[PDB]
Amino acid sequence: KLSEEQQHIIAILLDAHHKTYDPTYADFRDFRPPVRMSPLSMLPHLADLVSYSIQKVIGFAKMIPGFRDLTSDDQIVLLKSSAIEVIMLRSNQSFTMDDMSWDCGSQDYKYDVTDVSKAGHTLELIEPLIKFQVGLKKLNLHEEEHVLLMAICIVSPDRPGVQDAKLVEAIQDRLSNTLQTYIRCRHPPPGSHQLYAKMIQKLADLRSLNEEHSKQYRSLSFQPENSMKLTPLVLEVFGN
């Protein structure tokens, strides 16, 4: 059953998320304006959006029970590789299957296939990204399960450059073991049916999206003229 430590972990992850994911999207107004007409018209806006989101994923990561015991180098390595994946994951909260789009509180901040395609990335990425959103949405995870997945996603021992992988793994196992248990005791059937395997599969899907995103990035960032529309954080994290 759910020990005191496990319930503690869940409380912590839920609060960390609440402090890093603003469901009112009030800060979106600070980003460079969106332009829907396309010569990468949406890049300035979405670049700022992603950059802001990187900062928020970092804030979340810091509060993951045990993340503080890793070294600075491992922390950087885990976030550098997981950022994009976690942003894709946290975005499921604004993604609606009614019109297949990310509804972030208002018309201007409601992005669909065509908006998200006006930023230097091709359908090689976008199609698989939406499909992911749809399937994740169809798992109807408890918010508890959502935050445990993002946490598990960040602390993955097989990320490129990880050093003390044994520690990364131990930390993850604790979260992973908390999740498997939460499903068994808090998620009733049939929704619980192979829910864990389904959630882990999504982690593999993210790896695939991550890989494709990298290629799309090297490409977009090949023309210095385009690397200009990005932010310093994005360049450092994704590639400068």
Binding site: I76, L233, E236, V237
Partner: peptide, 11 residues
């Protein structure tokens, strides 16, 4: 590989 910003945000 020297990520000043990432490093500073994680501190």
């Amino acid at each position: 590989k020297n990520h000043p910003m990432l490093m500073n945000l994680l501190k």
